């Protein structure tokens, strides 16, 4: 059909421009602005660099395809080959190191922002370029031109010993498939499967029940009066309801084991708290309605349940039958919507929300403000990798299959088209999945 | 040479993308945003619509270039051609009206209120497309592919009755040249000369001695030490040369009429400034060397003379006897040359050059921000017209020359149409850099 060339020409151009103008824009935006040089970005720079270099080979790819020969002579042949191979290795290694970076990021939100973290990244980038020189440089040496057959066409390619070109070619191409694909991709996959585990682990262990109730119930090292006027101390520990400070001091002294005079140490208050928690838990497991719900909840949502018993007691909580069964069916919002309608919510809105937020999200976000950036950045890296693999897999299997086996040139060019498309996609991905890039691109391209 | 193909592919690509994407973006922005509905922008839309269409033909051209023939058959041939012509006539007629529209904004402000509206511009746009349809539709009619002889190449082109073919082509090419270039360009030239003349004419009514000295002398409402260290206030008003600050305060407290404590209102600053100016003018009229010169000078150059006295004093200025004589003979350049030799020019070059330029030009040009002469939007249009002409001149003359009168020049034709294609992708970029609004709306669209 007459449309094919037109469509291909158009697509080809868009990819080249976005791929070349896109990545070159990224590289610059970073190098110039110290404001944004982060472990993740320094890698992206390396990525964009490889992706920009490779995009400049498009006008060679096509012009070669049109003439069906290599006009560019030896030098250019040796160069674009070393690019071809540098891009291939450089970008995959970078993405693996990015994943690894994200991996150690989930347990270190503090070190992520440091003097070294960005610097280490710079160094690694180089190490990647040195390792890639392995095949990058050998591409410069082996790269060469030859006049094939009777045809007046010229071929640009790596030149191995004649006849045994087959073995060395097969040898190299397999090595490529091992090191530039199999290893990194699996390493990456392992990197993420484990990362989601560390995240699950961090979402439970990022907060304890002590930090929770200390925010809702407060902490006092001296006897004080409840909101209802009752004498209490520490974290929501009712001493007595009777209006005698001497009784509150009496009851308190039995609680600690010494003569307190209405004054307890922080440590003592923790011991008291831990006893009160245990007491509440024993009460939950003794209660017919709460036990099954408690057993069925994750530790974070359990904390919320304990939190409620602390405030209104075991009996008070069991009356939320409609919301309890919903939790036991893991219908988190349905539960959250019902609890908000309760009187408990009306008379203590702020706290109630924090508890409901816990039941709904299954996290400590209500109590322990989490940085949304770590998750946003991590999903940036994930997607970029995801897209890469999708785009570079067709080409890696196609080169492997042709070599291992004994028309179909269309498939090659399609596979080639993806790898090129990947390079024009990344720049876009940076812009939509990282609000800092979007602000920098904006402020730079439209001031 | 091996590098040429690479360079062209790359440049071809960017031209295409920016051209198709850039003009698509313009049309969209103009359509969705109320503040983008303006006479000028309605033309811009029409223009970008033409630039977008012609850009869709780039991939066809590269194809026909490589295969050397037309694979797309007549239907696409007749279409791709009408676009070739539509684009040509539509775009140029728009820029003309765009220029005319601006000419009205400047030389017919009163009628401009009623004439310049998105609606009237839409109507005019439509006409341009109906007008262009005379060659756009006939292109559809005369468009067709004929298999060439002596070769197996298909040819997409206008098909006039053979035997008379050579002359019809020429007939049309001449007419296309007159109507799609010479005439619009002339009108545009007339428009833009009438504008600058009236802008120049108005700009010299928007200046005066006061605004002039406010810039040269500056303004500070609290007491400060001048360039030579003497206490000063307001607009270059020297209080005293005594370094007491209390005498400065005592000098200010007097003649203002209150105890200022070293701080005056902006109104009090003018009161003083007006007094200093009146004093300078009274100074000029009492001095026999300056009076006759002052009298013979026009308003603007009179200000230039008052400025000088204001700075270095009546007597000081009257020592420029050679320059003064030349100024009373209306020989400005010769006088400006002398004044530049003065110590006044060496000590305070920036100011002196501005004052001298005023005596030279007789205008306030020395007291503006460079090319603030034309407005943000008028400047835009004038740049877009310029680039267009520069870009479309080569192809127009080329087509015409060959038509009157050589197989290696094929490379020229291709360079000439590269300028045309390139101009289509340039506009979108110019809109962004030369219009704060486009720049603003592109931003929101691309990077929310
Ligand atoms: C966009 C990406 C996927 C292109 C970039 N590249 C750059 C160099 C290139 C333009 C070229 C270079 C030399 C001669 C020629 O005909 C074509 C042409 C191979 C395309 N990369 C490749 O084609 C890679 C894919 C690959 C996969 C496995 C393996 O063992 C070796 C290779 C080497 N070529
Ligand atoms: C970008 C602009 C300047 C191109 C766009 N255009 C679009 C159509 C075109 C691709 C084409 C159309 C049909 C066959 C063919 O080989 C080529 C090819 C003429 C290029 N337009 C032209 O070159 C104009 C230039 C011109 C100047 C004087 C005149 O009497 C007639 C014409 C007609 N074509
Ligand atoms: C095509 C012919 C259209 C004829 C153009 C008629 C002139 C109208 C005019 O004077 O321009 C004012 C306009 O509304 C400012 O955008
Ligand atoms: C193609 C060339 C198109 C020329 C179009 C318009 C110029 C004349 C505009 C109309 C002038 C009307 C006369 C008039 O009364 O204008 C009042 C005054 O100028 C208001 O500021």
Cβ separation B13–A12 shorter than 8 A: yes
CA distances from A62 to A69, A153, A402, A413, B216 (A): 11, 15, 22, 10, 62
CA distances from A307 to A217, A260, A281, A303, A363 (A): 9, 27, 10, 6, 14
Cβ separation B17–A12 shorter than 8 A: no
List, comma-separated, the residues after which chain B is broken, a break being a C to N distance over 2.5 A; otherwise answer none: 405
Cβ pair B203, B363 in contact under 8 A: yes
Helix A299-318 to helix A349-361 angle (10° resolution) is 130
Q: Which two tokens stand for residue A297?
A: 């909840």
* Residues of A whose CB is below 8 A from B18: 17
DSSP state of A263: B
Q: Which two tokens stand for residue B279?
A: 């004093």
Q: Is the CB of B247 inside 8 Å of chain A's CB atoms?
A: no
Helix B376-404 to helix B165-177 angle (10° resolution) is 160
Q: Which two tokens stand for residue B319?
A: 């020592």
Cβ separation A63–B6 shorter than 8 A: yes
Helix H or strand E segment including A143:
strand A143-147
Q: B370's torsion region: left (phi>0), alpha (psi -120 to 50) or beta?
A: left
What is the dihedral angle through the alpha carbons of A438, A439, A442, A444, rounded to the nearest 10 degrees?
Answer: -120
Cβ separation B60–A6 shorter than 8 A: yes
Cβ pair B13, A19 in contact under 8 A: no
Which own/partner pairs from A186-194 qualify as long-range (CB within 8 Å, at least 24 positions apart)? A187/A96, A187/A99, A187/A100, A188/A95, A188/A96, A188/A99, A188/A385, A191/A96, A191/A99, A191/A100, A191/A102, A191/A103, A192/A99, A192/A382, A194/A103
CA distances from A422 to A52, A58, A102, A188 (A): 11, 13, 21, 18
Tell me which residue of A125, A140, A115, A135 sits closest to A93, measured CA to CA. A125
Active site residue B334: no
The response to whether residue B110 sits with its C-beta less than 6 Å from ligand 4 reads yes
- For chain A, how big is the Rg over CA atoms in Å? 32
Q: Which residue has the tokens 């070159």?
A: A24
Tell me which residue of A2, A5, A8 sits closest to B145, measured CA to CA. A2
Q: Is the CB of B440 inside 8 Å of chain A's CB atoms?
A: yes
- A62: nearest CA partner in chain B: B9
Beta-strand runs (E) in A215-306: 220-225, 231-234, 237-240
- β-bridge mates for residue A225, sequence order: A231
Q: What's the resolution in A?
A: 2.9
Using DSSP bridges, classify how beta strands B237-240 and B231-234 pair: parallel, antiparallel or unpaired. Answer: antiparallel
Residue A226 to chain B, least CA–CA distance (Å)? 50
- β-bridge mates for residue B144, sequence order: B157
Q: Nearest ligand to the C-alpha of residue B198? A: 4
Q: Report the alpha-carbon distance of residue A235 to residue B360 in Å, rounded.
A: 87
Cβ separation A2–B73 shorter than 8 A: yes
Q: What angle do CA B145, B147, B151 make, to 5 degrees?
A: 140
CATH 1.20.1070.10 domain span(s) along chain A: 1-207+368-447
Residue A80 to chain B, least CA–CA distance (Å)? 13
The response to whether residue B3 sits with its C-beta less than 6 Å from ligand 4 reads no
B157-169 b/e (C-beta count within 10 Å ≥ 16 → b): ebbeeeeeeeeee
Q: Report the alpha-carbon distance of residue A125 to residue A131 in Å, rounded.
A: 10
Cβ pair B404, B170 in contact under 8 A: yes
Q: Which two tokens stand for residue A278?
A: 């245990």
Q: Which of A7, A14, A442 sits opposite B443 (nearest CB)?
A: A442
- Count the Cβ atoms, other than its own, within 10 Å of residue A273: 21
Cβ pair B427, B391 in contact under 8 A: no
Q: What angle do CA B241, B246, B250 make, to 5 degrees?
A: 85
Q: Look at chain A and count its residues.
A: 447
Using DSSP bridges, classify how beta strands A231-234 and B220-225 pair: parallel, antiparallel or unpaired. Answer: unpaired
Which position among B51, B216, B217, B268 bears the catalytic label? B217
CATH 1.10.530.40 domain span(s) along chain B: 208-367
The response to whether residue A19 sits with its C-beta less than 6 Å from ligand 1 reads no
Q: Which two tokens stand for residue B139?
A: 């292109």
User: Does residue B339 have a known ligand-binding role?
Assistant: no
Which own/partner pairs from A440-447 qualify as long-range (CB within 8 Å, at least 24 positions apart)? A440/A29, A440/A33, A440/A36, A441/A25, A441/A29, A441/B446, A441/B447, A442/B443, A442/B446, A442/B447, A444/A25, A444/A29, A445/A25, A445/B443, A445/B446, A445/B447, A446/B432, A446/B439, A446/B440, A446/B442, A446/B443, A446/B446, A446/B447
Q: Which two tokens stand for residue A315?
A: 């009996």
Beta carbon pairs, A and B, within 8 Å: 71
Greatest Cα pair distance, chain B, in angstroms, is 103
Q: Which two tokens stand for residue A420?
A: 């090129």
Cβ pair A366, A358 in contact under 8 A: yes
The response to whether residue B111 sits with its C-beta less than 6 Å from ligand 4 reads yes
**The three-state (H, E, C) secondary structure of chain B, written as one string:** CCHHHHHHHHHHHHHHHHHHHHHHHHHHHHHHCHHHCCHHHHHHHHHHHHHHHHHCCHHHHHHHHHHCCCCCHHHHHHHHHHHHHHHHHHHHHHHHHHHHHHHHHHHCHHHHHHHCCHHHHHHHHHHHHHHHHHHHHHHHHHEEEEECCCCCCEEEEECCCCCCHHHHHHHHHHHHHHHHHHHHHHHHHHHHHHHHHHHHHHHCCCCCHHHHHHHHHCCEEEEEECCCCCEEEECCEEEECCCCCHHHHHHHHHHHCCCCCCECCHHHHHHHHHHHHHHHHHHHHHCCCCHHHHHHCCHHHHHHHHHHHHHHCHHHHHCCHHHHHHHHCCCHHHHHHHHCCCHHHHHCHHHHHHHHHHHHHCCCHHHCCCCCCCCHHHHHHHHHHHHHHHHHHHHHHHHHHHHHCCCCCHHHHHHHHHHHHHHHHHHHHHHHHHCHHHHHHHHHHHCC
Q: What angle do CA A115, A116, A117 make, to 5 degrees?
A: 105
Please tell me the distance between residue A97's alpha carbon and the centre of ligand 2 in angstroms: 52
Q: Which two tokens stand for residue B142?
A: 């005369």
Tell me which residue of A99, A129, A310 sits closest to A216, measured CA to CA. A310
Cβ pair A53, A89 in contact under 8 A: no
Greatest Cα pair distance, chain A, in angstroms, is 112
Q: Report the alpha-carbon distance of residue A180 to residue A89 in Å, rounded.
A: 5
Q: Look at chain B and count its residues.
A: 448
* Residues of B whose CB is below 8 A from A17: 13-14, 17-18
Q: Which residue has the tokens 């925010």?
A: A215
Q: Nearest ligand to the C-alpha of residue B124? A: 3
Q: Report the alpha-carbon distance of residue B77 to residue B145 in Å, rounded.
A: 7
**Could you give phi then psi for residue A146, rounded to 5 degrees?**
-155, 145
* Helix ranges, A56-182 (H): 58-67, 73-105, 116-142, 165-177
Which own/partner pairs from B406-411 qualify as long-range (CB within 8 Å, at least 24 positions apart)? none
Which residues, 6 or more positions from B191, have their beta carbon under 8 angstroms from its beta carbon? B99, B100, B102, B103
Question: Measured from the CA of B417, which atom of ligand 2 is nearest?
Answer: 3
Q: Which two tokens stand for residue A17?
A: 């421009």
Tell me which residue of A71, A88, A81 sits closest to A141, measured CA to CA. A81
Cβ pair B334, B326 in contact under 8 A: yes
**The three-state (H, E, C) secondary structure of A162-187, written as one string:** CCCHHHHHHHHHHHHHHHHHHHHHHH
The response to whether residue B104 sits with its C-beta less than 6 Å from ligand 4 reads yes
Q: Which CATH superfamily is domain B1-207+368-448 in?
A: Rhodopsin 7-helix transmembrane proteins (1.20.1070.10)
Which residues, 6 or more positions from B86, have their beta carbon under 8 angstroms from its beta carbon? B50, B53, B129, B132, B133, B135, B136, B139
**Which residues of A fall in the annotated binding site for substrate?**
238, 310, 323, 338
- For chain B, how big is the Rg over CA atoms in Å? 31
Which own/partner pairs from B334-340 qualify as long-range (CB within 8 Å, at least 24 positions apart)? B335/B359, B336/B360
Tell me which residue of A87, A99, A67, A57 sits closest to A392, measured CA to CA. A87
DSSP state of A12: H
Q: Report the alpha-carbon distance of residue B253 to residue B261 in Å, rounded.
A: 7
Q: What strands, in cross-sheet order, belong to the sheet with B220-225?
A: B220-225, B231-234, B237-240
Q: A408's torsion region: left (phi>0), alpha (psi -120 to 50) or beta?
A: left
- β-bridge mates for residue B224, sequence order: B232
Cβ separation B448–A438 shorter than 8 A: yes
Residue A32 to chain B, least CA–CA distance (Å)? 20
Which own/partner pairs from A252-255 qualify as long-range (CB within 8 Å, at least 24 positions apart)? A252/A223
Q: What strands, in cross-sheet order, belong to the sheet with A237-240?
A: A220-225, A231-234, A237-240
Cβ pair A63, A125 in contact under 8 A: no
Burial class (CB in 10 A: 0-12, 13-18, 19+), A384: buried
Active site residue A402: no
**Which residues of A fall in the annotated binding site?**
238, 310, 323, 338
Q: Which residue has the tokens 């020049």?
A: B409
* Residues of B whose CB is below 8 A from A60: 6
Q: Is the CB of B1 inside 8 Å of chain A's CB atoms?
A: no
Q: Which residue has the tokens 């791929």?
A: A19
Cβ separation A10–B2 shorter than 8 A: no
- β-bridge mates for residue B222, sequence order: B263
Q: Report the alpha-carbon distance of residue B399 to residue B155 in Å, rounded.
A: 18
User: Using what technique was this structure determined?
Assistant: X-ray
* Residues of B whose CB is below 8 A from A62: 9
Helix H or strand E segment including A146:
strand A143-147
- β-bridge mates for residue B147, sequence order: B154
Cβ pair A216, A124 in contact under 8 A: no
Q: Kindly report the CATH number that applies to the domain delimited by A1-207+368-447.
A: 1.20.1070.10
Tell me which residue of A405, A396, A403, A413 sits closest to A160, measured CA to CA. A403
Please tell me the distance between residue B442's alpha carbon and the centre of ligand 3 in angstroms: 29
Q: Report the alpha-carbon distance of residue A27 to residue A19 in Å, rounded.
A: 12
Which own/partner pairs from A74-79 qualify as long-range (CB within 8 Å, at least 24 positions apart)? A74/A143, A74/A144, A74/A145, A76/B2, A77/A143, A77/A144, A77/A145, A77/A156, A77/A157, A78/A139, A78/A140, A78/A141, A78/A143, A78/A144, A79/A140, A79/A143
Tell me which residue of A141, A182, A95 sits closest to A397, measured CA to CA. A182
The response to whether residue B109 sits with its C-beta less than 6 Å from ligand 4 reads yes
Using DSSP bridges, classify how beta strands A237-240 and B143-147 pair: parallel, antiparallel or unpaired. Answer: unpaired
The SS3 call for residue A44 is helix
Q: Report the alpha-carbon distance of residue B292 to residue A354 in Å, rounded.
A: 88
Q: Report the alpha-carbon distance of residue B287 to residue B282 in Å, rounded.
A: 9
Sign of the alpha-carbon dihedral angle for A76, A79, A81, A87: negative
Q: Which residue has the tokens 């730079």?
A: A444
Which position among A217, A268, A276, A434 bears the catalytic label? A217
Burial class (CB in 10 A: 0-12, 13-18, 19+), B342: middle
The SS3 call for residue A107 is coil
Cβ pair B339, B348 in contact under 8 A: no
- Count the Cβ atoms, other than its own, within 10 Å of residue B130: 10
Q: Terminus-to-terminus CA distance in chain A, angstroms?
A: 45
Please tell me the distance between residue B104's alpha carbon and the centre of ligand 4 in angstroms: 6
DSSP state of A407: -
* Residues of B whose CB is below 8 A from A5: 59, 63, 71
Helix H or strand E segment including A214:
helix A209-216
Q: Report the alpha-carbon distance of residue B8 to residue B17 in Å, rounded.
A: 14
Q: Which two tokens stand for residue B80?
A: 């791709």
Domain A208-367 has CATH 3.40.50.980: no
- β-bridge mates for residue B232, sequence order: B224, B238
Q: Report the alpha-carbon distance of residue A84 to residue A416 in Å, rounded.
A: 11
**Could you give phi then psi for residue B224, rounded to 5 degrees?**
-145, 155
Q: Which residue has the tokens 């151009």?
A: A13
Q: What angle do CA B344, B348, B352 make, to 5 degrees?
A: 70
């Amino acid at each position: 059909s007459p449309a094919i060339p037109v469509i291909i020409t158009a697509v080809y151009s868009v990819v080249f421009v976005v791929g070349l103008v896109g990545n070159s824009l990224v590289m610059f935006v970073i190098i110039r602005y110290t404001k944004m040089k982060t472990a993740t970005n320094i890698y992206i720079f390396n990525l964009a660099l490889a992706d920009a270099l490779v995009t400049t080979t498009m006008p060679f790819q096509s012009t070669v395809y049109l003439m069906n020969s290599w006009p560019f002579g030896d030098v250019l042949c040796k160069i674009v080959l070393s690019i071809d191979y540098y891009n291939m290795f450089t970008s995959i290694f970078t993405l693996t190191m990015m994943s690894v970076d994200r991996y150690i990021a989930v347990c270190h939100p503090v070190k992520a922002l440091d003097f070294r973290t960005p610097l280490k990244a710079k160094i690694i980038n180089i190490c990647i370029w040195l390792l890639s020189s392995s095949v990058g440089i050998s591409a410069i040496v082996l790269g060469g031109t030859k006049v094939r057959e009777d045809v007046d066409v010229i071929e640009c390619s790596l030149q191995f010993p004649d006849d045994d070109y087959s073995w060395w070619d097969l040898f190299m191409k397999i090595c490529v498939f091992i090191f530039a694909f199999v290893i990194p991709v699996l390493i990456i996959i392992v990197c993420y499967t484990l990362m989601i585990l560390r995240l699950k682990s961090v979402r439970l262990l990022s907060g304890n029940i002590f930090e929770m109730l200390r925010i809702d119930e407060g902490l006092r090292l001296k006897i004080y009066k409840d909101t209802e006027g009752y004498y209490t101390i520490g974290i929501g520990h009712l001493l007595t309801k009777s209006p005698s400070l001497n009784a509150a001091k009496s009851e308190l002294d039995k609680a600690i084991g010494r003569n307190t005079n209405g004054v307890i140490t922080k440590d003592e208050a923790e011991k008291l708290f831990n006893q009160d928690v245990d007491a509440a838990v024993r009460g939950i497991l003794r209660n017919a309605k709460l036990k099954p719900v408690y057993d069925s909840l994750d530790a974070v949502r359990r904390a919320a349940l304990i939190n409620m018993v602390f405030q209104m007691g075991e009996t008070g909580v069991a009356g939320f039958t409609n919301s309890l069964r919903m939790l036991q069916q893991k219908r988190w919002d349905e539960a959250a919507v019902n609890l908000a309608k309760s009187r408990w919510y009306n008379q203590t809105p702020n706290r109630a929300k924090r508890v409901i937020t816990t039941f709904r999200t299954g996290t400590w976000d209500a109590y322990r403000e989490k940085d949304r950036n770590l998750r946003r950045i991590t999903r940036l890296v994930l997607v970029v990798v995801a897209v890469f693999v999708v785009c570079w897999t067709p080409i890696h299997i196609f080169i492997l299959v042709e070599a291992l086996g004994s028309a179909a040139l269309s498939s090659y060019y399609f596979c080639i088209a993806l790898g090129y498309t990947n390079s024009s996609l990344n720049p876009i991905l940076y812009a939509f999945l990282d609000e800092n890039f979007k602000r920098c691109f904006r402020d730079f391209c439209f001031p």
